[PDB]
mmCIF file of N, CA and C in Angstrom:
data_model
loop_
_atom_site.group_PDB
_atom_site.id
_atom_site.type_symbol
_atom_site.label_atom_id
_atom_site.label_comp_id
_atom_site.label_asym_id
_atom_site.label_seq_id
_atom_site.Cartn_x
_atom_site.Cartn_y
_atom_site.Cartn_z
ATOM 1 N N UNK X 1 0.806 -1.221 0.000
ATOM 2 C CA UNK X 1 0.000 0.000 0.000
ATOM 3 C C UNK X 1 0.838 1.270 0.000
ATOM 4 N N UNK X 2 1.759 1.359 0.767
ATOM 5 C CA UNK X 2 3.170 2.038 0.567
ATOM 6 C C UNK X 2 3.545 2.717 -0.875
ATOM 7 N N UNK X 3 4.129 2.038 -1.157
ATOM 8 C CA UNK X 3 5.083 1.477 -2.375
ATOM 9 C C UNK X 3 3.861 1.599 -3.817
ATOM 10 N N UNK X 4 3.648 0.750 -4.035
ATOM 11 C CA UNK X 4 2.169 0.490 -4.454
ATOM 12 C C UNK X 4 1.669 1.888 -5.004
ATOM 13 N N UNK X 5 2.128 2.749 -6.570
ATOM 14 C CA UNK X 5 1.107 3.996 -7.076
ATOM 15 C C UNK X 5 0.774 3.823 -8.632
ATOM 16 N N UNK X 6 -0.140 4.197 -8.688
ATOM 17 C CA UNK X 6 -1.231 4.016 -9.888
ATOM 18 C C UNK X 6 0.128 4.126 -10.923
ATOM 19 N N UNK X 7 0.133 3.632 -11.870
ATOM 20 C CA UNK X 7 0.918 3.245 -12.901
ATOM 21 C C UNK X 7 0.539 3.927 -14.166
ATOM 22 N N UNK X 8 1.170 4.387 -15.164
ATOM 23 C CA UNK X 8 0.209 5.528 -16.074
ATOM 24 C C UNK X 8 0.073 4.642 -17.392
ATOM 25 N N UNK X 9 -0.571 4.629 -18.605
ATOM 26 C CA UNK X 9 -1.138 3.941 -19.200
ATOM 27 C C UNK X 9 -0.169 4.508 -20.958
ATOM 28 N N UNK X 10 -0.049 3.950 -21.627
ATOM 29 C CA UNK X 10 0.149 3.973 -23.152
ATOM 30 C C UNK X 10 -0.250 2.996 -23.818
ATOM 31 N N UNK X 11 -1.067 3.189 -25.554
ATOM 32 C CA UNK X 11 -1.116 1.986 -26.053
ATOM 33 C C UNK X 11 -0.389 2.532 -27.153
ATOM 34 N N UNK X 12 0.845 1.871 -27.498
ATOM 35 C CA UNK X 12 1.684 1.879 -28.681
ATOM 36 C C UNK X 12 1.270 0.936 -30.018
ATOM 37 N N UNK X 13 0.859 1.271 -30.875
ATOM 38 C CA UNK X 13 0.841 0.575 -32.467
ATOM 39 C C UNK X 13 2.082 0.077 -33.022
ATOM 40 N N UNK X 14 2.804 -1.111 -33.374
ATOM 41 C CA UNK X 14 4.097 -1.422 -33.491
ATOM 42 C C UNK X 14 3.580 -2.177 -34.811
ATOM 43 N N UNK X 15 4.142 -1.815 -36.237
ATOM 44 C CA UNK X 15 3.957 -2.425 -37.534
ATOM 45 C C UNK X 15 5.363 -3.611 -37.480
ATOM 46 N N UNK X 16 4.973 -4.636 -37.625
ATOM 47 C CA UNK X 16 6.444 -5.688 -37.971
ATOM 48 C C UNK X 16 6.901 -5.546 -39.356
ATOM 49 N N UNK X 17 6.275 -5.209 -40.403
ATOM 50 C CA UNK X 17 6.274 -4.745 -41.669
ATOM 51 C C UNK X 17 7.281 -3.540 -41.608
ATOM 52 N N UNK X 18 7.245 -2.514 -40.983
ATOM 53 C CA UNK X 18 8.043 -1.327 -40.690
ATOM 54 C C UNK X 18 9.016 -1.593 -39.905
ATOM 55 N N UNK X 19 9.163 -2.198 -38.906
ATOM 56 C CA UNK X 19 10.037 -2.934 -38.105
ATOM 57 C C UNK X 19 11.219 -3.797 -39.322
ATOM 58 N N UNK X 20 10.766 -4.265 -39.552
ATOM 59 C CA UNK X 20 11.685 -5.487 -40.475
ATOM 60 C C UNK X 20 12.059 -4.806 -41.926
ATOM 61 N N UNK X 21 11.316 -3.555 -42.509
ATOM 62 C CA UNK X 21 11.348 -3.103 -43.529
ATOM 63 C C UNK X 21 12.634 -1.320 -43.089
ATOM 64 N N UNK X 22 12.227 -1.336 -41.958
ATOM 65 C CA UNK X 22 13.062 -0.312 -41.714
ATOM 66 C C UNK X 22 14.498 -0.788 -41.084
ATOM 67 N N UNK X 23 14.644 -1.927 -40.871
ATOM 68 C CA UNK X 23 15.982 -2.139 -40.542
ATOM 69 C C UNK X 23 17.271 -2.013 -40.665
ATOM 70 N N UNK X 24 18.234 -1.797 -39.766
ATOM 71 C CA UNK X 24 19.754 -0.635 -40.311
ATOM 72 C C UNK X 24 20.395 -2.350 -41.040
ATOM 73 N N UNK X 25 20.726 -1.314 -41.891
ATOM 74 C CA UNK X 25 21.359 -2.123 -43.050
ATOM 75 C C UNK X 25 22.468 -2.987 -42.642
ATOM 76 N N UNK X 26 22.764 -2.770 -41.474
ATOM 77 C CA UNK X 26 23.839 -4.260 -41.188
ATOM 78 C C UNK X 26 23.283 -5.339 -41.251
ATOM 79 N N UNK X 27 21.929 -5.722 -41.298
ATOM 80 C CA UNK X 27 21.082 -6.409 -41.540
ATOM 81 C C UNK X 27 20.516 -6.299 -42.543
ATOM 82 N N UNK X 28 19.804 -7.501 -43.304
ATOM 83 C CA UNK X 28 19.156 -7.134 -44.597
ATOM 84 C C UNK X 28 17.659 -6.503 -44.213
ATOM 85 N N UNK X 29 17.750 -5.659 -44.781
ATOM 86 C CA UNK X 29 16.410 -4.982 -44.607
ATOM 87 C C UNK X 29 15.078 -5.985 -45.898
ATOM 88 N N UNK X 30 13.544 -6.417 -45.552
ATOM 89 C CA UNK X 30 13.366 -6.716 -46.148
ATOM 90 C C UNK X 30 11.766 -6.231 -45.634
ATOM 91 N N UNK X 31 11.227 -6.399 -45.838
ATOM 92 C CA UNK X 31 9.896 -6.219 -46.250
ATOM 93 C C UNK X 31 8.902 -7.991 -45.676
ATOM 94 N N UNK X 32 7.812 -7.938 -45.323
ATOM 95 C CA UNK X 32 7.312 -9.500 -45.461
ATOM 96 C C UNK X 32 6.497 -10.024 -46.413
ATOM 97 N N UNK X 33 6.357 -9.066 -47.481
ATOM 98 C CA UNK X 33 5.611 -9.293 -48.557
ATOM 99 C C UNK X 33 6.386 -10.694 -49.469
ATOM 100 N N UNK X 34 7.906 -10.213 -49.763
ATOM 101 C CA UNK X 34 8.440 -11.119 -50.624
ATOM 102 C C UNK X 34 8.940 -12.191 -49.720
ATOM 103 N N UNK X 35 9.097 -12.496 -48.928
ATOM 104 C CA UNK X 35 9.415 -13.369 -48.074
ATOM 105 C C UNK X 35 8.581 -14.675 -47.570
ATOM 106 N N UNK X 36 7.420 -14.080 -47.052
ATOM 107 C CA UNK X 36 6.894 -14.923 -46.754
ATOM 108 C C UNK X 36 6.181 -15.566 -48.002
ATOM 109 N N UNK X 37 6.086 -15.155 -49.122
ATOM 110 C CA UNK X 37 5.127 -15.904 -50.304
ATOM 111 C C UNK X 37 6.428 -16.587 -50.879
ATOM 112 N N UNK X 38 7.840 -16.810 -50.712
ATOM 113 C CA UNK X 38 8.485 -17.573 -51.042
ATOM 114 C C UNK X 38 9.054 -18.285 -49.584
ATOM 115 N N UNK X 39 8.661 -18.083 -48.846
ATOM 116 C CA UNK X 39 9.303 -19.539 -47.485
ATOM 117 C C UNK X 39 7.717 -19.646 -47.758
ATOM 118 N N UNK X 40 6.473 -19.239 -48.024
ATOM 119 C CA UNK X 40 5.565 -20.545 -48.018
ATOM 120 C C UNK X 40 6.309 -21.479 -49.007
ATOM 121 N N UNK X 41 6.511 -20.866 -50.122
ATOM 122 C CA UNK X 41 6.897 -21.848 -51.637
ATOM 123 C C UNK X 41 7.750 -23.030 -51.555
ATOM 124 N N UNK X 42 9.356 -22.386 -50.690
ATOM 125 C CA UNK X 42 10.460 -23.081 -50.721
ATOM 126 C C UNK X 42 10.500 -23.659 -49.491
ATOM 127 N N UNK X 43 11.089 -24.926 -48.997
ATOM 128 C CA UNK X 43 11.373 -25.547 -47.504
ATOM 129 C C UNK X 43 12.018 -24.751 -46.815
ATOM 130 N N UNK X 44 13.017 -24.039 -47.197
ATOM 131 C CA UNK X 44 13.924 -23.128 -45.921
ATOM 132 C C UNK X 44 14.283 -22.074 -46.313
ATOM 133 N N UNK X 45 14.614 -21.042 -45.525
ATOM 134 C CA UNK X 45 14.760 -19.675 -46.284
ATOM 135 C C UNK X 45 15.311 -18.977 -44.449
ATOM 136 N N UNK X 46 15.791 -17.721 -44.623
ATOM 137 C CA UNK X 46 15.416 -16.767 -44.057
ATOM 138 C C UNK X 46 16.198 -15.327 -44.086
ATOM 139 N N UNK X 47 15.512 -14.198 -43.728
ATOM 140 C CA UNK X 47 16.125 -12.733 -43.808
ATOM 141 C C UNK X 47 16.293 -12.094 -42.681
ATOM 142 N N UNK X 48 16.835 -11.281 -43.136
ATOM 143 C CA UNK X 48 17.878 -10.348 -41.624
ATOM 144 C C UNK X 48 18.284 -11.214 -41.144
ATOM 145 N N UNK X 49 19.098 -10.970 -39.823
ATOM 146 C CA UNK X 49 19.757 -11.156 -39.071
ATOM 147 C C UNK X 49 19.557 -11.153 -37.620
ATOM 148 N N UNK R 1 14.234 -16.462 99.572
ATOM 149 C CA UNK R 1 12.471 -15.923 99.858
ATOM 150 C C UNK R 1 11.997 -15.280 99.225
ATOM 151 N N UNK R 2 12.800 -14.345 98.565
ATOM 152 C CA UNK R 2 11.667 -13.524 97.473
ATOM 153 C C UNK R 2 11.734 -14.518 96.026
ATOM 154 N N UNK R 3 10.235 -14.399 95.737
ATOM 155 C CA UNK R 3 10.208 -14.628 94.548
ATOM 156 C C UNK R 3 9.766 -14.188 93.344
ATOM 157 N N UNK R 4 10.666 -14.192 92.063
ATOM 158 C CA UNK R 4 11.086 -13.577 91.391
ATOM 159 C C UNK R 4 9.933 -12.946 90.203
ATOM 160 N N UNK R 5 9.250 -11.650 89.661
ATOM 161 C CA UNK R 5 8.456 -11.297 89.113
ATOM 162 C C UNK R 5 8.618 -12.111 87.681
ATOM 163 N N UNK R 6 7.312 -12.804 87.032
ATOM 164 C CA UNK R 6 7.253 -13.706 85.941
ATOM 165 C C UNK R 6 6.943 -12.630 84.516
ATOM 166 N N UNK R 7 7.753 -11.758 84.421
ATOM 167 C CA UNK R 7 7.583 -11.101 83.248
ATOM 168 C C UNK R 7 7.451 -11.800 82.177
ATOM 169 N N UNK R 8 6.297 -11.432 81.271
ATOM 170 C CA UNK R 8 5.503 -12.127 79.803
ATOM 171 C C UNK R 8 5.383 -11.054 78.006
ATOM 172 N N UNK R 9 6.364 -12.253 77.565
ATOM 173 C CA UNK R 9 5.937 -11.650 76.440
ATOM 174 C C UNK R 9 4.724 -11.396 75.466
ATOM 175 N N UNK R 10 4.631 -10.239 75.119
ATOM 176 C CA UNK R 10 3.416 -9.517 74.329
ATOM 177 C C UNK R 10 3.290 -10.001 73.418
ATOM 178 N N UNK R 11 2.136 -10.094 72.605
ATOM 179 C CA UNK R 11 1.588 -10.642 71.373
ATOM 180 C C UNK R 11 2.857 -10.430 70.168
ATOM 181 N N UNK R 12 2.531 -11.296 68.965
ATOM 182 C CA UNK R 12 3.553 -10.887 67.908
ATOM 183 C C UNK R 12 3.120 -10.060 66.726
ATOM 184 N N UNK R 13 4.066 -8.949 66.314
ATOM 185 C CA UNK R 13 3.254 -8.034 65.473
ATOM 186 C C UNK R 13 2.549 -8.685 64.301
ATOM 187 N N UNK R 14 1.510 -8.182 63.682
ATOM 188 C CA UNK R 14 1.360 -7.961 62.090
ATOM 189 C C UNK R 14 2.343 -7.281 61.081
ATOM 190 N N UNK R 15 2.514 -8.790 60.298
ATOM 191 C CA UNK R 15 3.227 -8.243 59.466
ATOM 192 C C UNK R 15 2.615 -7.567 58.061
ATOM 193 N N UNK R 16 2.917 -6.764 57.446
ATOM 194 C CA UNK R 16 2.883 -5.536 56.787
ATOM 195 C C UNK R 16 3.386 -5.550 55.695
ATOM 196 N N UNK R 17 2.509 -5.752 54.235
ATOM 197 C CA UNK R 17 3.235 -5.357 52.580
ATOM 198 C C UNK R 17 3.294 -4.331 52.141
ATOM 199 N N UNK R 18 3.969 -3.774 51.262
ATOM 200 C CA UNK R 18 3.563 -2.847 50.686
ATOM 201 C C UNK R 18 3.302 -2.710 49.554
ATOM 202 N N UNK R 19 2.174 -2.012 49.148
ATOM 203 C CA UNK R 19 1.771 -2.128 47.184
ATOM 204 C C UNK R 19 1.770 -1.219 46.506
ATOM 205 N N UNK R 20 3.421 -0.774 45.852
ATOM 206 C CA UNK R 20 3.191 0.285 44.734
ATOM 207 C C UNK R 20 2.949 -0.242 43.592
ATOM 208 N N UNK R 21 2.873 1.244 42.706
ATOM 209 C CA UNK R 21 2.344 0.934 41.329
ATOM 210 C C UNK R 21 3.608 1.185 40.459
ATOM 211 N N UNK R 22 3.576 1.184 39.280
ATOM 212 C CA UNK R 22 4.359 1.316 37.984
ATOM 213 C C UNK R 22 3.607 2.005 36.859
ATOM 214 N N UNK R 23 4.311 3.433 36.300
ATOM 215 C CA UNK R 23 3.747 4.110 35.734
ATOM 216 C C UNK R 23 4.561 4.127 34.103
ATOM 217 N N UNK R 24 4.116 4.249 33.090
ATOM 218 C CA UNK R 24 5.168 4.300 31.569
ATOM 219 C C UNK R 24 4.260 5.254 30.462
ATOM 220 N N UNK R 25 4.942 6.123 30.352
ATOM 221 C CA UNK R 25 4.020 7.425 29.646
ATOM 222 C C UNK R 25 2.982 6.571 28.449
ATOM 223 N N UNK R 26 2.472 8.070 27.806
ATOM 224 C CA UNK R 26 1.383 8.093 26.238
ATOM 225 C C UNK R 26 2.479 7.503 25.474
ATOM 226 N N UNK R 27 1.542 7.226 24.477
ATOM 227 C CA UNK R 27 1.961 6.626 23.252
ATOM 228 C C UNK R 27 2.198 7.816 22.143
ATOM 229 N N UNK R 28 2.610 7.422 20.846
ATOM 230 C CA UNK R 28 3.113 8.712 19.832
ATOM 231 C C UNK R 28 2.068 8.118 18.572
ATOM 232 N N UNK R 29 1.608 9.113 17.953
ATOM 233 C CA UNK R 29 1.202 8.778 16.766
ATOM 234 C C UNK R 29 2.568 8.538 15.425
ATOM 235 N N UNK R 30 1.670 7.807 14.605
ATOM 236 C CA UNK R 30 2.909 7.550 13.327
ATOM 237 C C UNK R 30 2.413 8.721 12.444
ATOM 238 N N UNK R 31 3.212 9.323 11.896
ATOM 239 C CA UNK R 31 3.033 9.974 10.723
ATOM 240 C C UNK R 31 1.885 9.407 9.468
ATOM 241 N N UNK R 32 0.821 9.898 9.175
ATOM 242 C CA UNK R 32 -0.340 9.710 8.400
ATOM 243 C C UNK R 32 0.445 9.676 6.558
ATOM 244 N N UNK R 33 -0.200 8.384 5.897
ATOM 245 C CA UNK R 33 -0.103 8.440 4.724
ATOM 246 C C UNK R 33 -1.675 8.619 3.019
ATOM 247 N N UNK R 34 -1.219 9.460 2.476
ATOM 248 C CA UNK R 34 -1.957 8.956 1.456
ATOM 249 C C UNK R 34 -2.040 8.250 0.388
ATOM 250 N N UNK R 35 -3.217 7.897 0.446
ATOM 251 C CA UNK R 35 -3.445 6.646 -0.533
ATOM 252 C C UNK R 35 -5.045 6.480 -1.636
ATOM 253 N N UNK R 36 -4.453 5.640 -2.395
ATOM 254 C CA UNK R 36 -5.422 5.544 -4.030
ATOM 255 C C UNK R 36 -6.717 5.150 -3.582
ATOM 256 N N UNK R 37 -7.257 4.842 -2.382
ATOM 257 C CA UNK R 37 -8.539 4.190 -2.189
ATOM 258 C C UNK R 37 -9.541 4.871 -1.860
ATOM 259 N N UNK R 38 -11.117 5.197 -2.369
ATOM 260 C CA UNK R 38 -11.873 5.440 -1.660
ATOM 261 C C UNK R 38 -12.212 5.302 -0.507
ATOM 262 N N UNK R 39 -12.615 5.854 0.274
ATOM 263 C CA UNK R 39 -12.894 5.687 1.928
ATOM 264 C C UNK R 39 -13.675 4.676 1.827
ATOM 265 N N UNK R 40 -14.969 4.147 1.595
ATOM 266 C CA UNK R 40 -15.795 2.540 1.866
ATOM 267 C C UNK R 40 -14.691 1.507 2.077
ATOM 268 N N UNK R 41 -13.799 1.611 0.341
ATOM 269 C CA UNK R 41 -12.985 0.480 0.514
ATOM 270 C C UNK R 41 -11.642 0.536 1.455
ATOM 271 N N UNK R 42 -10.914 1.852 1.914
ATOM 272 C CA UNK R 42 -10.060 1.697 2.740
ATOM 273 C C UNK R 42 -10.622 1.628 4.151
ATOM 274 N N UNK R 43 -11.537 1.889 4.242
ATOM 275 C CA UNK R 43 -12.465 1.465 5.527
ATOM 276 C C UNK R 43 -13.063 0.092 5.560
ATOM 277 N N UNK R 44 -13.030 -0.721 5.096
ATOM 278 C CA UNK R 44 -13.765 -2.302 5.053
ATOM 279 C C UNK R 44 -12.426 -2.708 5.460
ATOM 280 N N UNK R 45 -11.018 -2.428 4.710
ATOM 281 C CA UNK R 45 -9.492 -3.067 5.147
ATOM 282 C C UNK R 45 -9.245 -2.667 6.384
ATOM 283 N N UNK R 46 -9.554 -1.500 6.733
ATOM 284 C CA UNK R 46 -9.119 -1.012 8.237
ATOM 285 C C UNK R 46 -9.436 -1.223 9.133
ATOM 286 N N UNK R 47 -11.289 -1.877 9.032
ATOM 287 C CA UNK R 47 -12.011 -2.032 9.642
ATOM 288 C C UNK R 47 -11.384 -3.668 9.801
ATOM 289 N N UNK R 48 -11.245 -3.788 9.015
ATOM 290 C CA UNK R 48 -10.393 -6.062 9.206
ATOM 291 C C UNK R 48 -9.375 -5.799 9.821
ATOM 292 N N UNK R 49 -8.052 -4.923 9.223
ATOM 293 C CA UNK R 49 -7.223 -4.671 10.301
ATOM 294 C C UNK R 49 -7.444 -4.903 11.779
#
């Protein structure tokens, strides 16, 4: 009860599309459009890092 | 020929207690806190307290 004070609230929107598409180029930056319609296609695949 | 006066001892006193008391001051209040609860509900906890 002390210790214990109301906590304040945010709701953040986080795109993984923008996330993975904006990535610093030490990594491959890619998008999930082309990706995922070829790892459905092919057995193994993957991007970035 | 003379004979000798039969001096007698007197009853034996009451013996005697004595009963004092023991005195230890007021008490201190704690410093008052505030808190997130409406009075009903911090009063139902206080009241269990």
């Amino acid at each position: 009860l002390k210790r214990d004070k109301r906590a304040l609230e945010v709701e953040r929107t986080v795109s993984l599309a923008e996330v993975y598409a904006g990535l610093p180029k030490d990594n491959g930056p890619f998008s999930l459009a082309q990706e995922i319609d070829k790892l459905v296609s092919q057995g193994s695949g993957s991007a970035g890092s | 020929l003379y004979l000798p006066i039969y001096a007698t001892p007197a009853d034996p006193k009451a013996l005697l207690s004595a009963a004092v008391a023991t005195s230890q001051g007021g008490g201190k209040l704690p410093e008052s806190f505030m808190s997130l609860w409406r009075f009903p509900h911090m009063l139902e906890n206080a009241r269990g307290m």
